Amino acid sequence: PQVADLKAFSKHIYNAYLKNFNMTKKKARSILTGAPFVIHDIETLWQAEKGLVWGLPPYKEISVHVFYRCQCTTVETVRELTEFAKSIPSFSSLFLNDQVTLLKYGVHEAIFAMLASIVNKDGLLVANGSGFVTREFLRSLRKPFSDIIEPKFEFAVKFNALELDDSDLALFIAAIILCGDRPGLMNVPRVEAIQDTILRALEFHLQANHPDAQYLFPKLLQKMADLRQLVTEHAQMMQRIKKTETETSLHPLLQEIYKD
């Protein structure tokens, strides 16, 4: 009945996910278990840069160059998240303006959620798996660039402890985007209703895919809550970069998200 009709709904979201995201956690963990060129310093960064692994703003500095790469990566993940969102029927039913409102306020949360998929205790994949940047190298970046990405690792390791597969993620992400709590959201009841359908689908999907997993569901709800905080602290550091990092330019689409 309920538990039957939702299976469908869940598989459909999983297909949108497989169809749209550049990198699946399956593909990610694989590469991270088994190779990618390791970037742990300037030498290897310049190396990776040239041809080793790899249209950015004019060079300016090491730490900033990385910041720019982060931007390029984020912009690309925002494009996927958008396509993924549109691949969910109920999401497209919404007026174009509300769709943009959900993406505007939910993508970073989604992005940091998925970041966990390509991240292990020591670093993270880059360039479609082609390379691996060390966590220690990021930490060495001149501040404030060295602070921004570190909290994400902390988040990611705990998150990865839940051992979620791509099918769980598709639903988890969907839940994040379809959140009726977003500012200026127009058809709040509609969004809320879709979110609920997603959460119920998620739970049923979890007791199936993770039989013996104790408190998985409510734990995921807390993670959503955490991502909300993670993004908030991220936005704060971002305002500090816009204030003090006068020379560092910001991608237009990213400024639109961070303006209000």
Ligand X SMILES: CCCCCCCN(CCc1ccc(O[C@@](C)(CC)C(=O)O)cc1)C(=O)Nc1ccc(F)cc1F
Ligand Y SMILES: CCCCCCCO[C@@H]1O[C@H](CO)C(O)C(O)C1O
Query: Which residue, chain included where needed, has tokens 């088994």?
Result: 34
- Least CB distance to ligand Y at residue 170 (A): 19
- Least CB distance to ligand Y at residue 173 (A): 15
Query: Which residue, chain included where needed, has tokens 């990610």?
Result: 28
- Segment 52 to 71, residues that bind ligand X, using CB under 6 A: 66, 69-71
111 binds ligand X (CB under 6 A): yes
Judged by CB under 6 A, the residue of 83, 154, 233, 256 near ligand Y is: 256
Residue nearest to ligand Y (CB): 256
254 binds ligand X (CB under 6 A): yes
Range 117-148 burial, b when 16+ CB lie within 10 A, else e: bbbbeebbbbbebebbbbbebbeebeeebeeb
Q: What is the token pair recorded at 219?
A: 């734990």
169 binds ligand X (CB under 6 A): no
Q: How big is the chain by its Cα radius of gyration, in Å? A: 19
Binding mask 81-120 toward ligand Y (x if CB under 6 A, else -) reads -x-----------------x--xx----------------
User: How many alpha carbons fall within 13 Å on the CB side of residue 62?
Assistant: 16
- Least CB distance to ligand X at residue 142 (A): 14
Judged by CB under 6 A, the residue of 118, 174, 175, 191 near ligand X is: 118
Q: Give residue 257's identity as a one-letter amino acid code.
A: I
Burial bucket for residue 27 (CB in 10 Å: 0-12, 13-18, 19+): middle
159: which residues sit within 8 A by CB, 6+ positions away?
113, 116, 223
108 binds ligand X (CB under 6 A): yes
135 is in the binding site of which of ligand Y, ligand X, none (Cβ under 5 to 8 A by kind)? none
- Segment 205 to 234, residues that bind ligand X, using CB under 6 A: 234
Minimum CB distance to ligand Y smaller for 97 or for 229: 97
In this structure, how many other beta carbons lie within 10 angstroms of the beta carbon of residue 248? 17
126 binds ligand X (CB under 6 A): yes
73 is in the binding site of which of ligand Y, ligand X, none (Cβ under 5 to 8 A by kind)? ligand X
Compute CA 228 distance to the chain's CA centroid, rounded to the nearest angstrom.
12
110: which residues sit within 8 A by CB, 6+ positions away?
81, 173, 176, 177
Task: Give me the residues that bind ligand X (CB under 6 A), please.
Answer: 39, 66, 69-71, 73-74, 77, 108, 111-112, 114-115, 118, 124, 126, 133, 148-149, 234, 238, 254
Task: Give me the residues that bind ligand Y (CB under 6 A), please.
Answer: 82, 100, 103-104, 256-257, 259-260
